[PDB]
Design a protein around this ligand. Sequence first.
Ligand SMILES: *[C@@H]1O[C@H](CO)[C@@H](O[C@@H]2O[C@H](CO)[C@@H](O)[C@H](O)[C@H]2NC(C)=O)[C@H](O)[C@H]1NC(C)=O
Ligand SMILES: *[C@@H]1O[C@H](CO)[C@@H](O[C@@H]2O[C@H](CO)[C@@H](O)[C@H](O)[C@H]2NC(C)=O)[C@H](O)[C@H]1NC(C)=O
Ligand SMILES: *[C@@H]1O[C@H](CO)[C@@H](O[C@@H]2O[C@H](CO)[C@@H](O)[C@H](O)[C@H]2NC(C)=O)[C@H](O)[C@H]1NC(C)=O
Ligand SMILES: *[C@@H]1O[C@H](CO)[C@@H](O[C@@H]2O[C@H](CO)[C@@H](O)[C@H](O)[C@H]2NC(C)=O)[C@H](O)[C@H]1NC(C)=O
Ligand SMILES: C[C@@H](N[C@H]1CCN(c2ccc(CC(=O)O)cc2)C1)c1cccc2ccccc12
Ligand SMILES: C[C@@H](N[C@H]1CCN(c2ccc(CC(=O)O)cc2)C1)c1cccc2ccccc12
Ligand SMILES: N[C@@H](Cc1c[nH]c2ccccc12)C(=O)O
Ligand SMILES: N[C@@H](Cc1c[nH]c2ccccc12)C(=O)O
Ligand SMILES: *[C@@H]1O[C@H](CO)[C@@H](O)[C@H](O)[C@H]1NC(C)=O
Ligand SMILES: *[C@@H]1O[C@H](CO)[C@@H](O)[C@H](O)[C@H]1NC(C)=O
Ligand SMILES: *[C@@H]1O[C@H](CO)[C@@H](O)[C@H](O)[C@H]1NC(C)=O
Ligand SMILES: *[C@@H]1O[C@H](CO)[C@@H](O)[C@H](O)[C@H]1NC(C)=O
Ligand SMILES: *[C@@H]1O[C@H](CO)[C@@H](O)[C@H](O)[C@H]1NC(C)=O
Ligand SMILES: *[C@@H]1O[C@H](CO)[C@@H](O)[C@H](O)[C@H]1NC(C)=O
Ligand SMILES: [Ca+2]
Ligand SMILES: [Ca+2]
Ligand SMILES: [Ca+2]
Ligand SMILES: [Ca+2]
Ligand SMILES: [Ca+2]
Ligand SMILES: [Ca+2]
Ligand SMILES: [Cl-]
Ligand SMILES: [Cl-]
Lengths: 791, 792
Amino acid sequence: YGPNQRAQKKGDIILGGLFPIHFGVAAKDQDLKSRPESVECIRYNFRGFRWLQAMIFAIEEINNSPNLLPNMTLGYRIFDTCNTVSKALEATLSFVAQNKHIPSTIAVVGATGSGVSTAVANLLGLFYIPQVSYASSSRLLSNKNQFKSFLRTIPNDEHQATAMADIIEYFRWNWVGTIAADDDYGRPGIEKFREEAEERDICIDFSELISQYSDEEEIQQVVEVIQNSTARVIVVFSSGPDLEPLIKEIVRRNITGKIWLASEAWASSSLIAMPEFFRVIGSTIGFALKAGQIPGFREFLQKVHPKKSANNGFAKEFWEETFNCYPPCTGDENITSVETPYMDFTHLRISYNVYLAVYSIAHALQDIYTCTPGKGLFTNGSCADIKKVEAWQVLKHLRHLNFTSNMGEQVDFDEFGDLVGNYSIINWHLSPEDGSVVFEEVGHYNVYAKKGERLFINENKILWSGFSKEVPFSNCSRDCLPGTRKGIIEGEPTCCFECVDCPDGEYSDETDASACDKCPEDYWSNENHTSCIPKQIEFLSWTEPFGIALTLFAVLGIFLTSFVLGVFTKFRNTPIVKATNRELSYLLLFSLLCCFSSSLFFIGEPQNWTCRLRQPAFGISFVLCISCILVKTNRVLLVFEWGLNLQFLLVFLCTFVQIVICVIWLYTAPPSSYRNHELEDEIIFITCHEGSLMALGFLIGYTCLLAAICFFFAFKSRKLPENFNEAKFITFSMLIFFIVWISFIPAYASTYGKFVSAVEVIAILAASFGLLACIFFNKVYIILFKPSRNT
Amino acid sequence: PNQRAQKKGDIILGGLFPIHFGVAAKDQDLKSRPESVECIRYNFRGFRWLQAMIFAIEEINNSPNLLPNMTLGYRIFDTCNTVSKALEATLSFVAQNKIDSPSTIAVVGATGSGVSTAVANLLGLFYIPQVSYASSSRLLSNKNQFKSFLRTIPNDEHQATAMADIIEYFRWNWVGTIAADDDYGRPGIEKFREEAEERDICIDFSELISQYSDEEEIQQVVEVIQNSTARVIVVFSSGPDLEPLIKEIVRRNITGKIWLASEAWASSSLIAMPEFFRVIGSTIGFALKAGQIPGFREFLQKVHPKKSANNGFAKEFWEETFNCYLRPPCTGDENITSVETPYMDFTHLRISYNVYLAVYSIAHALQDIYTCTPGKGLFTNGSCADIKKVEAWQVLKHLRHLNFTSNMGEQVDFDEFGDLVGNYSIINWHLSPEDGSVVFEEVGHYNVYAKKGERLFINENKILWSGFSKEVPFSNCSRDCLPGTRKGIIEGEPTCCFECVDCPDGEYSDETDASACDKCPEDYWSNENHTSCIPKQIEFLSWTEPFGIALTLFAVLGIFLTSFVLGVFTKFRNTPIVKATNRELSYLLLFSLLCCFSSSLFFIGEPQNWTCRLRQPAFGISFVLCISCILVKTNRVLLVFEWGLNLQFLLVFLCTFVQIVICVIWLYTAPPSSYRNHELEDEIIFITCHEGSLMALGFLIGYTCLLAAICFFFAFKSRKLPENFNEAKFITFSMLIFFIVWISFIPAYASTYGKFVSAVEVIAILAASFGLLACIFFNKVYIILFKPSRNT
Ligand SMILES: *[C@@H]1O[C@H](CO)[C@@H](O[C@@H]2O[C@H](CO)[C@@H](O)[C@H](O)[C@H]2NC(C)=O)[C@H](O)[C@H]1NC(C)=O
Ligand SMILES: *[C@@H]1O[C@H](CO)[C@@H](O[C@@H]2O[C@H](CO)[C@@H](O)[C@H](O)[C@H]2NC(C)=O)[C@H](O)[C@H]1NC(C)=O
Ligand SMILES: *[C@@H]1O[C@H](CO)[C@@H](O[C@@H]2O[C@H](CO)[C@@H](O)[C@H](O)[C@H]2NC(C)=O)[C@H](O)[C@H]1NC(C)=O
Ligand SMILES: *[C@@H]1O[C@H](CO)[C@@H](O[C@@H]2O[C@H](CO)[C@@H](O)[C@H](O)[C@H]2NC(C)=O)[C@H](O)[C@H]1NC(C)=O
Ligand SMILES: C[C@@H](N[C@H]1CCN(c2ccc(CC(=O)O)cc2)C1)c1cccc2ccccc12
Ligand SMILES: C[C@@H](N[C@H]1CCN(c2ccc(CC(=O)O)cc2)C1)c1cccc2ccccc12
Ligand SMILES: N[C@@H](Cc1c[nH]c2ccccc12)C(=O)O
Ligand SMILES: N[C@@H](Cc1c[nH]c2ccccc12)C(=O)O
Ligand SMILES: *[C@@H]1O[C@H](CO)[C@@H](O)[C@H](O)[C@H]1NC(C)=O
Ligand SMILES: *[C@@H]1O[C@H](CO)[C@@H](O)[C@H](O)[C@H]1NC(C)=O
Ligand SMILES: *[C@@H]1O[C@H](CO)[C@@H](O)[C@H](O)[C@H]1NC(C)=O
Ligand SMILES: *[C@@H]1O[C@H](CO)[C@@H](O)[C@H](O)[C@H]1NC(C)=O
Ligand SMILES: *[C@@H]1O[C@H](CO)[C@@H](O)[C@H](O)[C@H]1NC(C)=O
Ligand SMILES: *[C@@H]1O[C@H](CO)[C@@H](O)[C@H](O)[C@H]1NC(C)=O
Ligand SMILES: [Ca+2]
Ligand SMILES: [Ca+2]
Ligand SMILES: [Ca+2]
Ligand SMILES: [Ca+2]
Ligand SMILES: [Ca+2]
Ligand SMILES: [Ca+2]
Ligand SMILES: [Cl-]
Ligand SMILES: [Cl-]
């Protein structure tokens, strides 16, 4: 006969009912020293009584409506579960009694716990009795090979975990921790969330299991792992009662920084949503089912009375727990005078599910009632009769039930027995009028939209941590700027890293970089390694300051030479001084002008033209000059041997020799004007590799031997003072030439491109200048100052 | 139910065994009234288990001491591995208590964690002891919900720990998981995921299966298995819930993986088939420890459908064995020893022993109830119960405090969670050479009593991989990191597969699998392979150095020449024939030159503050002395312009001090610093000497050069006064050589590093002073060695 505290009402058809009027049982572990007696449940739950009242109201409204099942009445045998499996199981045993004078229940609306409903459906489905639950939302109840006769008016919990992952990815967090009740409601949900979050590149720090029967040390361990971690977001998948101990311990230890992502079961629970817990838990964003509309329901709630309820048996205990009677009292108080979750509501969510379940079973019964004897759902097109209806026929009609909810909706269960709905997203607020926690809706989750466009959050209503209004930071490691790269911290997950600076020559312009990048050769990483500033190029320039000095020196040399040439041109036909060789004079002067001009080739970038011309350019020009001044010496060879052609002919041997060398590189290995940087790695010199070294040596040596013979012959006879004994002058000249080159070799041996070229040009320009000077200074002086030209 | 094994007695036990493997797959669309479902495939192992229970019961009934005059009856049913059959059997068990709101006292068995949960939810309602023998889920240890559930099989958390330990023992880190979607696979796989994740082991994929998943789910699972690179696959499932996946695997011929079997299917007969074995090679599984039930086999060899009225399962057993009918009509004369079945083709009793132990434990609980004495009982006030009217909760209370010895001499004692622990044997699938059946050879041990870390013990010499090879396959996400490289993140992949990037020059990485390169200190530099660093190159002139050798020999030759000429004078040193000049000035100049030369001693090795801060000013003073001496050497027309010739000495001993002045300044203002510098080479450390005070060196050098310059001007302007070979010209040419050398040598000092800088400096000095000495003496020495014409 089941328990004695129950709600009961007769009728042709009887429906079952399991509601959590209490919260749990008295935890007195029977040591079995005596016969174990029936355990007792302890706490009270006004929400559960609201649900039971909703079911009773639905049945009464069905019995009152004249169209749905006329000339037939609905009865019920509603029991209490106290949220435990033992009570539900004894109740269901009282249900299926007559199967194998007692009424035979045809349908069961209840089992609000996914652990409770599992154990109930295991037993009901053995007799094929339809069980229409309203609040059990575990996914395991979708295995229609196990629970053959289980339907539910509440959506499955897959979309809830998906929505949790979507919310976490929307605020751009990647470091969270998960808590789930060690039950059939938290385990599968947390596993689904784990996979959905790992596929979205989200890292999970810790994962713990709790329960209302967990001892104190395990709660200590959980609080420790919560405190010892850096994750700010905590995804809780549990119900009110199985969460209350952890909340009490967290309030006692005063952990304040975290953010709670509430699941639907406890996001609106009065056990948790109280101010003293609110000050500590801070910000909670949770889900909620869609509201309902049961017109005329409040006026039914306001009529509950202990004496006017013979059918209802829990009304007495309700009166007691709400007024503390039997301190005996009157029984004529007002339910509106005290504030309890009973009528302190604005949106009916689970009560609407109970209403809908009762109405769906009534509609299946009507469907069986309005049959046509030819188009039935059973074998041979036959159909069943409502006077001897059995449970399996009602199950058959429920599987194919498809009707219209008074809100103008379509109600029809899937092939997995469940419905589907679109969640509201609420965020906990503190009412400035009362102090109580009030749930304000801030977002929506439509599950029909395509994957990726389902969530809609209105961020300006979310109140963060009570005061501030910017999204808190809950990443593992700080995201560091461009110029740096991620660096593995071994042991830690893929979301936690250090970041190391990029070396020079590599850059990174992106945030969250995986590696730095080498830029092309003529580019180089800048001072912040964020962008390769185009590199600089090494060579002498014309606007260059020291290049300016050099070029002005060259111009002055040419000016002096040409002006002296013109001054001669005054006396150019007064052989008074031209007792020397006129043509040799002009030739030497022009050779010097051109050698000077050669410096044109050392002030800018070398194209093959520039380099391979300039170098041999000096060669020929200076060699001409030297040979000319040399032949300027006494005619000893002429004395030893058809016009003076000889003199010209003489020079026009030596010259060719070196012109010879030029042509060789013209077709063997001409110098290469190319870019070189390997010795600087930051700036690219533009140098000119010698075409054939030893052949340059040969050239220079030939020239120096010509100069050396000139030197020897000018000195050895340097003491024959003819017209101021220019032997000595030219000797001193050739020696200056020697010394300059000598001393300047080192620099050429120990320097890069730029100053190498600069020193080379200085050397040449100045040496030729000195030659010209040493040869003319005296003569010009005398023929400008002492016009004593008779001998 | 109708078919059952029933025997009467004073005390009744219950049993639940999977005689069949499952029910006939047929979906009732409920067009008609549903009827009793039927079971399809036979299970000889379950029948051996049932026979073990019956054998234990009858043997206890035959013992004189254990339950002396009592009698044990039993009512054994079949679960068909489904929940509905078990639940209707249970409803048949609790009929006596159900009528409150043939009473059994205890039930032995569920065989399945789902069946166990569904049964214990109902049995714990009446406090009836349920002693399972194979239910190994961890959810049944929650004694707040399953009050009266005891099991004689170890829990399955140690099994997940053992699997993680095996994986980290064979050095794998890229694995994948498969689980049955029931109360046995899900908790085990979650526990293994935790245990692996804490050991830094990666899990590539994670799937769920069941015997009811249709072709598309299995195809998606096989796609996930194939499109991955993990070789090791852990499987937490039973035989039936794994058979479809195995069929699909053997059809698609996936033939590369390594299977880590859980206990349920490691020794299963549905999976251990020779045809499946070709593609499921290299199977490594767990097993319970063997038992000894003496006299069991002979009891098995007596089954017969006629002489078994208590047992009812014998008829279908014979029909399934001989494939007969009681199509060809059957006859009770066959030989159960002829056909080969999982019934009698066994070698170790592992789950039959658990049934034996469960029955014996219930018997010993009843015994403890029986040999109790008043005042020493366990119930209220020390009171004790009567065995002739024993109730279920009393046997439960006695079972919680049960402690006895097995037939093998071990201590059976249920933990406070109602489960006794045991070791694990570790087997590996082999192929029998004779017939061809799969043979399970024991290759390892797992002791749960040893401390964490030294529990596993594998014998590598017996494991054979893939049938032919004998080296452990490679199943890592990425190949290892060789020395000289470092790990590099791939943005999307998990932590255990990376890339290999090279350490830059200046950093090395000797360790394998290094997360970052290390920079060697100031003294060292990376190798070529960036493996270890070697010391950075030092930079300075050395004495054994070749060019240092050339320099030092030049210095020695200079000193030799000077000193030899000094001695040659010493011959004529008192013949003022040539000494018409100033004797003492002569000696002073010669000594100054010898010492300036000797100064070169300070440019051939590393500078200590001594060396640098002495050498530099060393040249200063020595050469300045020499210059002033030769200078004063010119006739003092200034002296005429101006008590002994002290004046001359005094003269010089002004100028000198000036520069000695400068020295003392750096002596206490900023003396040069002999330090190491490398920033311009980064590979070899020069050992240079930063100037103490630059502009003051400039002042010093300038003072010296102005002295030289006045000497030059005065020697030339009068360079045409040929007194004793007009040495005015000689000394002028000298001072000019000095000038030219310094001029031309400035550039190198301006454009070079340490080493050749010092070398050029020393060359310059040495040679210049040499030339001075020469230009001043060559002629005079020549004449007084060759033309001794000294009269005027
Ligand atoms: C925490 O880490 C995540 C990445 O794991 C960051 O999310 C990125 O945010 C930027 C800016 O919106 C996006 O461009 C990226 O696409 C995001 N990454 C991914 C994978 O979507 C997040 O910004 C970090 N949190 C903070 C405060 O910076
Ligand atoms: C799913 O959430 C969405 C959000 O409103 C609801 O879909 C809307 O319903 C109304 C009426 O059909 C339309 O005006 C909107 O256009 C719909 N939005 C979209 C994107 O289609 C819907 O009501 C929710 N699901 C249920 C069963 O109510
Ligand atoms: C599990 O672990 C070992 C088996 O390897 C058993 O301990 C050994 O038992 C024998 C005899 O009992 C001793 O001689 C050894 O010294 C033991 N070895 C160690 C390391 O202790 C142990 O008995 C097994 N546990 C059970 C319940 O059988
Ligand atoms: C696969 O990855 C693991 C992870 O390191 C490697 O394990 C290492 O193996 C060497 C050799 O014994 C050990 O010295 C290391 O200590 C191990 N690493 C860790 C963190 O324990 C393994 O070597 C890799 N597989 C192969 C074939 O190289
Ligand atoms: C401008 C100069 N040539 C310069 C530039 C190219 N050449 C050179 C020398 C040395 C090295 C490296 C080394 O050996 O250390 C590389 C190049 C020396 C020149 C012009 C005309 C006639 C010359 C007659 C005689 C010497 C020079 C002459
Ligand atoms: C050995 C030499 N001193 C050398 C070495 C140190 N000093 C120096 C010069 C220039 C720079 C950098 C720059 O300005 O480019 C750095 C150091 C020049 C010396 C010895 C004795 C008397 C001297 C009298 C006059 C000049 C030199 C004298
Ligand atoms: N889905 C919840 C049931 C539930 C929904 N809302 C609730 C509110 C309070 C308690 C329980 C619930 C479960 O599986 O347990
Ligand atoms: N322990 C398994 C059942 C099991 C163990 N060993 C077995 C051998 C054969 C069949 C089933 C089993 C479970 O929890 O369900
Ligand atoms: C709890 O922690 C917060 C952190 O600031 C602090 O403000 C508050 O005073 C603490 N309250 C108690 C009771 O410790
Ligand atoms: C309760 O008492 C009466 C009867 O219900 C009602 O009119 C009254 O408004 C209620 N009291 C309050 C404070 O609302
Ligand atoms: C049944 O479902 C269809 C569409 O699915 C809808 O048109 C109809 O209104 C539903 N109800 C009935 C009674 O057909
Ligand atoms: C199956 O896989 C194995 C290994 O690749 C190969 O030898 C064999 O040919 C494949 N096909 C069949 C039918 O076995
Ligand atoms: C047949 O039964 C008996 C056992 O007593 C014996 O002849 C023999 O063992 C059995 N046959 C075979 C092949 O074992
Ligand atoms: C259990 O039995 C053994 C053998 O009598 C004994 O050693 C032990 O003390 C007993 N009690 C416990 C708690 O083990
Ligand atoms: Ca309930
Ligand atoms: Ca990923
Ligand atoms: Ca609640
Ligand atoms: Ca780790
Ligand atoms: Ca079973
Ligand atoms: Ca099996
Ligand atoms: Cl509600
Ligand atoms: Cl076995």
